[PDB]
Design an enzyme around this catalytic site. Structure first.
Site, PDB file in Angstrom:
ATOM      1  N   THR G  31       0.972  -7.455  -5.666  1.00 30.94           N
ATOM      2  CA  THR G  31       0.824  -8.124  -6.915  1.00 30.94           C
ATOM      3  C   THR G  31       1.411  -7.294  -8.012  1.00 30.94           C
ATOM      4  O   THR G  31       1.607  -6.128  -7.833  1.00 30.94           O
ATOM      5  CB  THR G  31      -0.665  -8.360  -7.200  1.00 30.94           C
ATOM      6  OG1 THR G  31      -1.328  -7.145  -7.239  1.00 30.94           O
ATOM      7  CG2 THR G  31      -1.218  -9.311  -6.145  1.00 30.94           C
ATOM      8  N   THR G  32       1.707  -7.917  -9.153  1.00 28.08           N
ATOM      9  CA  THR G  32       2.388  -7.301 -10.245  1.00 28.08           C
ATOM     10  C   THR G  32       1.635  -6.270 -10.978  1.00 28.08           C
ATOM     11  O   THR G  32       0.517  -6.487 -11.417  1.00 28.08           O
ATOM     12  CB  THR G  32       2.858  -8.290 -11.274  1.00 28.08           C
ATOM     13  OG1 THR G  32       3.411  -9.405 -10.555  1.00 28.08           O
ATOM     14  CG2 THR G  32       3.951  -7.814 -12.351  1.00 28.08           C
TER      15      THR G  32
END
Lengths: 50, 232, 246, 238, 244, 204, 244, 241, 98, 242
Positions: G31-32
């Site tokens: 995930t970012t």
């Protein structure tokens, strides 16, 4: 198979030479070449090292 | 292809480890167990399997300590190592700090244990997932353990064979059991309902149900047999 | 078969040994000629760029003052193994014997480091065949070849490397049973100029001797009772001298 | 199948490395054991490779491990040689501990023990040697015969044969032998051994070797002459 | 691939290599144990590959204590290590508490050595390099649970049973135990029951050289029978079936 | 007594012109008990002779240890060790165990077959080269010997005069040494051959 | 291509180690995670996806703290990033004992890069597969790095990794344009949120939870702490306002 | 197929690696011991030679392991080198401990274990060395043995290893005499070495020789390595040169 | 035999003599300049074949016409050699077996 | 066909394919280095290629301070760059306290080179793909440049260059030294020797450089410092101005 090829090489050295006669110096070079070449299939003097 | 299994030390081109996913599979093939919690209790209810009807089932809840406990789903030799490891830590906490182990710190120690097998050539990532509950000083908690080693806190989850049916039960009835606090019976009853739904081609037996509970004024207690027969 | 150090072949032998031998043949040409009061050891240097300092390559490295070496084979393998050779020579045979070791004995230690690097699979043996020449007060001047097969042989004149086969007949023809060191030094350059031409000159051919004791190199004086270094490295200027009178 | 390696199991449940280990036993010389009631006789084929082979200094196929237990082997001769020495350090050590000489029952376990250990592990091959261990107890006078096999499994037999066409001697043995009455005279029991060994040599009376263990730390190796008389009795009757 | 690994999983989530070890357990001789409220009777079949094999100086029922016995099948080679470890555990318990070891608890120790497969895996330092090709029927008596029968599986962990068969004839034996068992049994009944099922799953003739009973009766201790005792029960059986 | 020399024994080495000699008494003692009359101090490996004085257990142990070390050399180089080289070999064996150390005073004697030149050396407990070619003495009569030897010492006596000089030095010293008094064996060493001559002397 | 993976130390003919490139691809699925360095601080924000709506909200973090002043956030596999931070806490702690001061950010950068490099250098371990953005404040001011699973690191004015690196690097690229000056840490809190909100259109199948942390010299006393309460709500309102 | 590591067997109960190790031997020169009650000769042949190979300054196929036991080598000289050092070290260990020069049997049995050990344990290579052990011990007198690379031993009255094992063995047993002479034993070794070896003339420099005798002065044991010139002279006597 | 007796090999590794000759003979049929050194392209790479010497010169005049020049400079020669330099690992410039 | 999936297993030509693919990994950051000798300095100027604008440029570097008198310039990849830099630093430290004096350019380069050989000797590590060039003015050798290669081959130099466009750098250098007939630059302060290295690199590549696009390390007598971007800038208009 070596020994028929010795005679082929000698007769090709003797062509350069340009004589009916085939001298023995041509049969000195033919052996020194067939013999050297088979020691490169044995990777130097490996019999010595084993 | 699939020549990027055969090693747990090789990344695939897609960036998965096939070996850890194949560990996730081993879980589904073993028994189902359900976790859920409130704020005064955490409760585990587990389907126990037998191999034949002279066999007398197999225990799938291990008491970790008197304020902690876990269930297993997947391979049983993998389970034994982790429930033993987990106990070392709980005893350590009592001996060195005189302190009850916190569920969250427990889980990250378990995470570590797993990543040790993942990096190493030799060994396997563990073939078992555990649903861990405890009640510490910050009240009840419930973690979901995986072979990758990810521990995730959840109000309710299920892993194992045909677990979507239990997760469906859980979703619908999420808020109902959160709001109930002070009545130990109701959380017990709710978990019973979930695991019924999980089943396909079976019915509940008095020796399928195993009930495990911890609370504010509830010691760790493992119910089986005629103790789950008030709440059958 | 050929292709583990562990696997024996149907006609036998390990193949890794044979392939390591191949490496030597891709090397540079080094050659030694035993005279009756010396051994001359000679090799060339190459480096690709001419912007390279040539006096920084190590290829004529004294192991002890009594015993010099050259190689043919891998350059990296040389420095490491010269380093190791020296280290063993003092431990087994200068703390015990009390002086720098015999030419025969030291050649056996060198072979023993190789041999350990054959026994342990996944660990290749050294890329080099060395020539190790020295002097001792028992067996005299001596010359050896120590192969990466971990066996060593004594020799009268020998050459190793790529140009070996051309050099050896020159050596057969031109060697005589009684020679001086100075006729050996000229025969050495002459043969080595077969190996390369267009680049042969006194600053790029490295040539040394293990000849007579030199107190000039001893560096302390007023002690007559010990000898000085047998070894002498000839400078670039000397190598040019000999190449003009030839 | 799953002979690529020792540790991996096999659909068929047979570790291949052990099975092939057995096969190796058939290479070596035949050895036969026959118990009496007052004797065990342990005989072995002593196959002669050439006529230049000494009888001056060349090893016998039968080796005493301790002074009242006797051992023959069948298998890879190279492998047997360390197996016999390992057996022996323990054997003597048995007295270091207890101040009692070596009991035959403790000894079979031990020989099976070194072997089992090698199989369990992966970074060693098993011994390709099955052995017969014959002997009596120190405490008692009832004859005891044991076997070890490559696998690390040990048994007791009344009479048992191993190596070089073992099958044919085994069947021979069944027919001749009686379990109701094992021979109670040392000589007749020897004679049964000679008859067995005759078969595998085809012709020889200088290639049959007989050794006997008797109780109270009597172990003797029989004269080449003495065996030929027994062969003389067996050829005449036939 | 999955099966030529040793810690390599298959796409169904089965450690195939370890799966294969179960068929090692079966190759050996049948043993059938039946727990009763009077004691556990453990029978075996012992193979004779020759009349010359001494089947009566070899056993596969072994003594572990004075109230713990074990049946086994598989590699007697691996049975030597599995039985030796278990004997150590009983004795070291006895050292530590001067008290009887529970049946189950002896089983936990036998399953700990079993866990070990590895060469990198963590939990305990892995020193043992393969699965064990050998199972146990574990019999004992603690007084706070009664007479009990547990089954050790080297590829799994401890299962409680009223009766189990292991060996070659396991599959067909198990049906008969589903059919005939009772909680209304005495040990006398129970003994002729092991024998009645055993013979049908036997291919060798039912005789005393190929058989051997033992019991865990707390009162009598671990007792391996006679050949003379086992021969009696064969007769009593024969009388029963003629009547029947 | 002292802990490094309860069991006594004396060795004396001299140089003559192109000859060495070495000699020792043959009494072994253990406190005040004289134990054996025959028990040599001096041992040899090839053409180098060594006496080893001291605590008697370590004389015997290094006799064996040095034989192992010398013979490994001889076989490998195909030639005898020399008494120049052999000096530094004693020095390393003694120093390896500086802590818990050998209790000996060995004295070499010997003549090179590459110079024809006498070489004698002494070493202590953890070993040293004492490279005098005056004369070298060790043993419990160390004090006694250094003076007796000095008095007699003229350099460059003929071999047979050298036999007179070392035998006399040894005999006077021995009578007045508590832990040696019985027997003597004198080695007169030359390039060509080595003659061993036991004395006849008093017992105590 | 084929070959020279299946090992993690084997060079390719191109001059690379394949398996190490496949690491980065796993980090991309993670995930970012972004960090925006600020003029008197650093802000770390992370996109924490919601597995199901049964997740406990604000009780699971991919933010972990190192010593008492160094923030770390990883993208890639969640437990791998954990394992790498634990090693980091021990290393920061040894530095701290030894010298009686907290770590420099350049110090930590060196040490971490050696531990990632160690697992690319050997044949019995799989290289890491996480990036880890980290930084904090020291004597020498604020600093920000992003460590790739290849074991590569540099300082960044601003760094992004994960599924949303496509959006996030672009937003940060506007951020330097609009502010080359530095941007205060406060205004960067509100900024941190908008960046994630647009990076969540690469993981649109699921819902997310926004967690912001910070470490600032003058508004956190050099110490790392989670941004919560009123500061955290304001950033939500900011991101919500401008996304619509 | 089964031509791999050493743990694995072939399903015919063959370890291919011991079988190949045997075959290693006949790619290094012939080596012969012939036992006689007057002494043992050990004789050996050089694997190859050139005109500027020095071989008159040293031996390298005849090593003394001690002062009563010596060995001829056939096979890889690298494999040989480590095993000769281990043998020799042990030979003196026996000397230190018992005050007797090591028995021939104890020394062969030790080395048979060691060869076996490199095949049996671990991943290490087996050895491909045949040593003809010729010794004296005061138990059995004169003794000949030879050890396989396989790691077992047999005693002999004559044996040939190295190249051309079958032929060299045949000519030896054809003309062998039970009591023999030391002098005849030396002659029978040149006679065989001529026909087996493909060198045109049999030169002193293609021979190494050592003899172990107690009949060259009794009371004592004398190991006599022949120098080049002694070798050179005895060829004359037998009329090959 | 009777058909082929000569099996005349044609190599791709070649040697320093024959790289030098093929270059000067191609550089005797087209323009040159005094700065254009041809005997420094046979040492940098070492496994070059005869067709690629016909690539290198052609491409030399393609840099030369990019500039719009009648002769071939050392700048032209080097750029065109870096195209189709070949990636072969049978080369010597990256070696250590000397 | 076997023989770069293994570190130690040779090819049938006697080459190690895998080790050579490390001489070919030095193009992975695609920078060029030049280091030349003056007469009281050793200069190294290598590119600083900062590709992205998300990067802060002042942490981008390849020049590492190893020790008081020792720098090192890296060509090739960053992960291995850092491993090379710690070991050379670690060894620099070890030499000083063990042997009680500063560390010369030879002593360090020989030790790393031997170390590379060890890493290729085992099959339990790999070679690194980095080329190291050490720069110093030595205590009694003066200006010294020693290039340590991935196999562990080393040779000293008057001038060396490394990188993708290294060949273009190499002709320009050769022609200079040929014409001058000295193994040095005779400019007698380091500020103009630096200018000389910039000068040759602009011509070789055909590219202008700017403040962010160069990195310059300077070994001076008995001291070492790496130059800021604004000092590099002063140098760059010194070139432009004559």
């Amino acid at each position: 198979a070596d020994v028929k090829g010795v005679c082929t090489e000698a007769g090709m050295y003797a062509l350069r030479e340009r004589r009916i006669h085939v001298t023995q110096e041509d049969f000195e070079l033919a052996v020194g070449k067939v013999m050297n070449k088979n020691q490169e299939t044995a990777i130097s003097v490996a019999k010595l090292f084993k | 292809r699939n020549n990027y299994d055969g090693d747990t030390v090789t990344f695939s081109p897609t960036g998965r480890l096939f070996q850890v996913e194949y560990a996730l599979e081993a879980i589904k093939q073993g028994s189902v167990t359900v976790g859920l919690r409130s704020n005064t209790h955490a409760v585990l209810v587990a389907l126990k399997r037998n191999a034949d009807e002279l066999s007398s089932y197999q225990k799938k809840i291990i008491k970790c300590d008197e304020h902690m406990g876990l269930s297993l789903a997947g391979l049983a030799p993998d389970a034994r190592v982790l429930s033993n490891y987990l106990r070392q830590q709980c005893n350590y906490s009592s001996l060195v700090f005189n302190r009850k182990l916190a569920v969250e710190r427990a889980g990250h120690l378990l995470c570590d244990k797993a990543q040790k097998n993942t990096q190493s050539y030799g060994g396997r990532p563990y073939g078992v997932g555990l649903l861990i509950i405890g009640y510490d000083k910050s009240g009840a908690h419930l973690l979901e353990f995986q072979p990758s080693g990810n521990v995730t806190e959840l109000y309710g989850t299920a892993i194992g064979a045909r677990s979507q049916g239990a997760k469906t039960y859980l979703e619908r009835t999420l808020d109902t059991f959160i709001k109930i606090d002070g009545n130990p019976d109701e959380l017990i009853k709710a978990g019973v309902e979930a695991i019924s739904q999980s089943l396909r081609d079976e019915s509940l037996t008095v020796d399928n149900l195993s009930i495990a509970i911890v609370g504010k004024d509830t010691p760790f207690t493992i119910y089986d047999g005629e103790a789950v027969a008030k709440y059958i | 078969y050929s292709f583990s150090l562990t696997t024996f072949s149907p006609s036998g032998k390990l193949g890794q040994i044979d392939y390591a031998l191949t490496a030597v043949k891709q090397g540079v040409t080094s050659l030694g000629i035993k005279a009756t009061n010396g051994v001359v050891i000679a090799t060339e240097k190459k480096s690709s760029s001419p912007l390279a300092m040539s006096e920084t390559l190590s290829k004529v490295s004294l192991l002890t003052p009594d015993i010099g070496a050259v190689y043919s084979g891998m350059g990296p393998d040389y420095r490491v193994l010269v380093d190791k050779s020296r280290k063993v020579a003092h431990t087994s045979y200068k703390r015990i014997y009390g002086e720098y070791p015999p030419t025969k004995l030291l050649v056996s230690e060198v072979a023993k480091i190789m041999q350990e690097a054959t026994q342990s699979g996944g660990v290749r043996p050294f890329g080099v065949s060395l020539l190790i020449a020295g002097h001792d007060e028992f067996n005299g001047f001596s010359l050896y070849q120590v192969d990466p097969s971990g066996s060593y042989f004594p020799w009268k004149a020998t050459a190793i490397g790529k140009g070996s086969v051309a050099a050896k007949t020159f050596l057969e023809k031109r060697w005589n049973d009684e020679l001086e060191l100075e006729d050996a030094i000229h025969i050495a350059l002459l043969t080595l100029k077969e190996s390369v031409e267009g680049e042969f000159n006194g600053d790029t051919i490295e040539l040394a001797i293990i000849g007579d004791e030199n107190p000039d190199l001893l560096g302390y004086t007023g002690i007559p009772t010990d000898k000085g270094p047998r070894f002498r490295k000839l400078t670039s200027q000397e190598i040019n001298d000999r190449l003009e009178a030839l | 199948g799953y002979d690529r390696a020792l540790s991996i199991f096999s659909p068929d449940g047979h570790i291949f490395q052990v099975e092939y280990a057995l096969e190796a036993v058939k290479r070596g010389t035949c050895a036969v054991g026959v118990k009496g009631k007052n004797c065990v006789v342990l005989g072995c084929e002593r196959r002669s490779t050439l006529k230049l082979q000494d009888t001056r200094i060349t090893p016998s196929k039968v080796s005493k491990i301790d002074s009242h237990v006797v051992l023959s082997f069948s298998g890879l001769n190279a492998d047997s040689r360390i197996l016999i020495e390992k057996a022996r350090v323990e054997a003597q050590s048995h007295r270091l501990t207890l101040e009692d000489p070596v009991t035959v029952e403790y000894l079979t376990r031990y020989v099976a023990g070194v072997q089992q250990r090698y199989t369990q592990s992966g970074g060693v091959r098993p011994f390709g040697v099955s052995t017969l261990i014959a002997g009596f107890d120190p405490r008692d006078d009832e004859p005891k015969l044991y076997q070890t096999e490559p696998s690390g499994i040990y048994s007791s037999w009344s009479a048992q044969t191993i190596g070089r066409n073992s099958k044919t001697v085994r069947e021979f043995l069944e027919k001749n032998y009686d379990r109701k009455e094992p021979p109670a005279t040392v000589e007749e029991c020897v004679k049964l051994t000679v008859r067995s060994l005759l078969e595998v040599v085809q012709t020889g009376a200088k290639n049959i070797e007989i050794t006997v263990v008797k109780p109270d730390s009597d172990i003797v190796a029989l004269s080449s002459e003495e065996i030929n008389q027994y062969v003389t009795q067996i050829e005449q009757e036939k | 691939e999955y099966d030529r690994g040793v810690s390599t999983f298959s796409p169904e989530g089965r450690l195939f290599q370890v799966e294969y070890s179960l068929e090692a357990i079966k190759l050996g001789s049948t043993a059938i144990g039946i727990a009763t409220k009077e004691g556990v009777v453990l029978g075996v079949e012992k193979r004779a590959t020759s009349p010359l094999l001494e089947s009566d100086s070899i056993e596969k029922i072994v003594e572990i204590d004075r109230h713990i016995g074990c049946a086994m099948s598989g590699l007697t080679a691996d049975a030597r290590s599995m039985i030796e470890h278990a004997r150590t555990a009983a004795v070291t318990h006895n050292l530590y508490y001067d008290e009887d070891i529970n049946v189950e608890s002896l089983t936990q120790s036998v399953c700990d050595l079993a866990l070990r497969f590895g060469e990198g895996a963590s939990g305990e330092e892995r020193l043992m390099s393969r699965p064990f090709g050998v199972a146990l029927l574990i019999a004992g008596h603690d007084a706070d649970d009664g007479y009990q029968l547990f089954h050790a599986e080297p590829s799994g962990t401890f299962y409680r049973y009223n009766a189990k068969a292991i060996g070659s004839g396991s599959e067909g034996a198990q049906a008969e135990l589903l059919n005939e068992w009772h909680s209304s049994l005495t040990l006398k009944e129970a003994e002729l029951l092991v024998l009645k099922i055993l013979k049908q799953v036997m291919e060798e003739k039912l005789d005393e050289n190929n058989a051997q009973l033992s019991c865990i009766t707390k009162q009598d201790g671990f007792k391996i029978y006679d050949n003379e005792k086992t021969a009696e029960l064969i007769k009593e059986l024969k009388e029963k079936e003629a009547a029947e | 007594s002292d802990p490094s020399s309860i069991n006594g024994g004396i060795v004396v080495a001299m140089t003559g012109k192109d000859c060495v000699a070495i000699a020792c008494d043959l009494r072994l003692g253990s406190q005040s008990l004289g134990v054996s009359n025959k028990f040599e101090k001096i041992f040899h490996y090839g053409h180098v002779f060594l006496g080893i004085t001291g605590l008697a257990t370590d004389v015997t142990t290094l006799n064996e240890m040095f034989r192992y070390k010398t013979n490994l050399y001889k076989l490998k180089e195909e030639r005898a060790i020399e008494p120049e080289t052999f000096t530094q070999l004693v020095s390393s064996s003694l120093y390896e165990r500086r802590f818990g150390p050998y209790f000996v005073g060995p004295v070499v004697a010997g003549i090179n077959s590459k110079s024809g030149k006498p070489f004698i050396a002494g070493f202590d407990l953890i070993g040293c080269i004492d490279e005098a070619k005056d004369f070298i003495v060790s043993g419990t009569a160390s004090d006694q010997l250094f003076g007796m030897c000095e008095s007699l010492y003229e350099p460059n006596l003929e071999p047979e005069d050298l036999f007179e000089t070392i035998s006399q030095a040894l005999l006077n010293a021995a009578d007045r040494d508590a832990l040696s008094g019985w027997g003597a064996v004198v080695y007169i060493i030359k390039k060509d051959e080595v003659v061993k001559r036991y004395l006849k002397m008093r017992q105590d | 291509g084929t070959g020279y993976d299946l090992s993690n130390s084997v060079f390719s003919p191109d001059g690379r180690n394949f398996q190490v490139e496949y690491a980065v691809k796993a980090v991309e699925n993670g995930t970012t995670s972004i960090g925006i360095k600020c003029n008197d601080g650093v802000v770390f924000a992370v996109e924490k996806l919601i597995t199901s709506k049964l997740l406990v909200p604000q009780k699971n973090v991919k933010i972990q703290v190192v010593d008492r002043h160094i923030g770390c956030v990883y993208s890639g596999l969640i437990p791998d990033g954990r394992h790498l931070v634990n090693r980091g806490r021990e290393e920061a702690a040894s530095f701290k004992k030894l010298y009686k001061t907290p770590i420099p950010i350049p110090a930590f950068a060196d040490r971490l890069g050696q531990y990632v490099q160690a697992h690319t250098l050997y044949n019995s371990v799989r290289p890491f597969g996480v990036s880890t953005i980290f930084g904090g404040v020291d004597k020498n001011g604020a600093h920000l790095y992003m460590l790739e699973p290849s074991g590569s690191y540099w300082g960044y004015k601003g760094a992004a990794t994960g599924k949303g690196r496509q959006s996030a690097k672009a937003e940060l690229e506007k951020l330097v344009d609009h502010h080359p000056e530095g941007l205060s840490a406060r205004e960067a809190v509100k900024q941190a949120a908008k960046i994630i909100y647009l990076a969540h259109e690469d993981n649109k199948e699921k819902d997310f939870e926004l967690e912001i942390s910070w470490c600032s010299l003058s508004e956190t006393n050099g110490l790392h702490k989670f941004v919560k309460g009123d500061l955290l709500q304001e950033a939500i309102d900011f991101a919500q306002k401008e996304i619509n | 197929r089964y031509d791999s590591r050493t743990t694995i067997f072939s399903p015919e109960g063959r370890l291919y690696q011991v079988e190949y190790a045997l075959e290693s031997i006949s790619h290094a020169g012939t080596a012969i011991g012939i036992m006689a009650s007057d002494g043992i000769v050990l004789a050996a042949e050089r694997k190859v030679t050139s005109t500027l190979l020095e071989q008159d300054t040293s031996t390298e196929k005849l090593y003394k392991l001690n002062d009563k036991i010596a060995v001829a080598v056939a096979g890889l000289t690298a494999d040989a080198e480590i095993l000769i050092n281990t043998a020799r070290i042990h030979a003196q260990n026996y000397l230190k401990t018992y005050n007797e020069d090591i028995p021939v049997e104890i020394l062969v049995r030790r080395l048979s274990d060691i060869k076996q050990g490199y095949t049996q344990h671990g991943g290490l290579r087996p050895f491909g060395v045949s040593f003809i052990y010729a010794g004296y011990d005061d138990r059995y007198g004169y003794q000949l043995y030879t050890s396989n690379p396989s790691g077992n031993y047999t005693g002999w009255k004559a044996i040939s290893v190295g190249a051309n094992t079958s032929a060299a063995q045949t000519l030896l047993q054809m003309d062998y005499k039970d009591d023999m002479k030391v002098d005849d034993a030396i002659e029978l070794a040149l006679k065989t070495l001529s026909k087996t070896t493909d060198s045109s003339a049999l030169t002193y420099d293609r021979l190494e020789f050592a003899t172990i005798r107690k009949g060259a002065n009794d009371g004592e044991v004398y190991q006599k390595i022949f120098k080049p010139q002694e070798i050179k002279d005895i060829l004359v006597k037998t009329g090959i040169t | 035999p009777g058909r082929l007796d000569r099996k005349i090999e044609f190599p791709s590794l070649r040697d320093r003599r024959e790289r030098r000759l093929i270059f000067g003979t191609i550089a005797s049929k087209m323009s040159l300049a005094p700065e254009a050194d041809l005997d420094s392209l046979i040492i940098r790479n070492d496994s070059l074949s005869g067709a690629v010497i016909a690539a290198i010169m052609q491409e030399a005049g393609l840099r030369a016409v990019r500039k719009n020049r009648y002769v071939i400079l050392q700048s032209d020669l080097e750029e065109a050699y870096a195209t189709q330099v070949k990636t072969d690992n049978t080369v010597d410039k990256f070696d250590f077996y000397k | 066909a076997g023989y770069d999936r293994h570190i130690t297993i040779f090819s049938p030509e006697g080459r190690l394919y895998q080790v050579e693919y490390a001489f070919k990994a030095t193009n992975q950051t695609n920078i060029n280095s030049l280091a030349v000798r003056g007469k009281d300095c050793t200069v190294v100027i290598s590119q600083k290629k900062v590709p992205d604008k998300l990067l802060d440029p002042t942490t981008v570097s390849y020049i590492f301070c190893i020790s008081r008198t020792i720098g090192m310039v890296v060509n090739g990849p960053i992960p291995d760059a850092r491993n090379a830099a710690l070991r050379a630093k670690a060894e620099a430290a070890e030499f000083r306290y063990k042997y009680g004096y500063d560390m010369p350019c030879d002593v360090l380069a020989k030790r790393m080179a031997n170390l590379s050989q060890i890493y290729t000797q085992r099959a339990y590590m790999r070679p690194l793909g980095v080329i190291l060039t050490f720069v110093s003015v030595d205590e009694e050798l003066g200006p010294s440049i020693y290039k340590t290669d991935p196999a562990g081959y080393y040779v000293g130099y008057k001038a060396t260059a490394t990188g993708p466009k290294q060949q273009e750098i190499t002709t320009n250098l050769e022609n200079h030294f040929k014409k001058s007939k000295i193994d040095h630059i005779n400019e007698e302060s380091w500020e103009k020797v630096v200018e000389f290295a910039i000068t040759h690199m602009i011509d070789a590549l055909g590219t202008e450089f700017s403040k962010n696009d160069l990195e310059v390390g300077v070994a001076t007598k008995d001291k070492f410092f790496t130059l800021s971007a604004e000092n590099i800038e002063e140098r760059l208009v010194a070139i432009a101005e004559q």
